[PDB]
């Protein structure tokens, strides 16, 4: 019945009472680094997501696989939560241990409206993960083509961008 379970389940009164004790650390991750905010986002618990954000939860926290809350909301198709996270300055191109961004997961799982919203907010379609796969190329064809069209008309360049980060080339 810890805070992580309450967030997964969307037990708003319990979460609110837990947060009322300022000795509790609302950013602290569980055994695999999932914060309260990660769980509420993953499971679609909109009211709890909002409560966490407005009480000061850090938006770009990372779990043990370097997923952010936005990766999880996108992956699980929670459209309103995606929008709330972006409003509160979530990094739309955040990068997990595999080089995947939130759009990779929205595409892979056919969360079409989330994927479209992400591109409408500027999410890059051409950025390869660590294994050379661009996010839109995880989608089925109708979505895949549509997102490239939407991105072009929003002024993106479609040139493939091989993966790089500060540690990639020693």
């Amino acid at each position: 019945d810890d805070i992580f379970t309450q967030c997964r389940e969307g037990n708003a009164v319990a979460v609110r009472l837990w947060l009322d004790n300022t000795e509790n650390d609302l950013n602290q991750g569980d055994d695999h680094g999932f914060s309260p905010l990660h769980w509420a986002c993953r499971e679609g618990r909109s009211a709890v997501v909002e409560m966490l954000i407005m009480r000061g939860a850090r938006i770009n926290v990372m779990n043990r696989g370097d997923d952010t809350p936005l990766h999880l909301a996108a992956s699980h198709g929670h459209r309103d939560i995606v929008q709330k996270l972006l409003q509160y300055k979530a990094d739309i191109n955040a990068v997990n241990e595999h080089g995947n961004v939130p759009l990779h997961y929205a595409c892979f799982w056919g969360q079409d409206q989330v994927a479209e919203d992400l591109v409408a907010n500027g999410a890059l379609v051409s950025i390869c993960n660590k294994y050379g796969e661009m996010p839109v190329d995880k989608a089925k064809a109708p979505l895949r083509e549509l997102l490239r069209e939407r991105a072009e008309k929003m002024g993106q360049n479609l040139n493939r961008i091989p993966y790089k980060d500060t540690f990639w080339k020693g």
Binding site: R64, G65, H98, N100, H104, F108, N129, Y131
Partner: protein
């Protein structure tokens, strides 16, 4: 799991993405479920499972590495 070359029902769909198959398409049968090759992959890294070994969490399939990182 086993690789097959599809010649089945028009109604047949991939267990993961719900899309259909082409005649002669190389697919995967895992425990009676059919998958596209690009769909019988880890939900976290999108790669093939080493030695075909996967671990489920809430109806998604993960490789050992990602299962151990996130859910074990």
């Amino acid at each position: 799991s086993e690789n097959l070359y599809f010649q089945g029902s028009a109604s047949a769909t991939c267990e993961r993405c719900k899309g259909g198959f082409a005649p002669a398409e190389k697919i995967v049968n895992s425990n009676g479920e059919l998958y596209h090759e690009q769909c019988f992959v880890c939900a976290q890294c999108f790669q093939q499972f080493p030695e075909g070994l996967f671990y489920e969490f809430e109806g998604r399939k993960y490789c050992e590495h990602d299962f151990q990182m996130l859910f074990a």
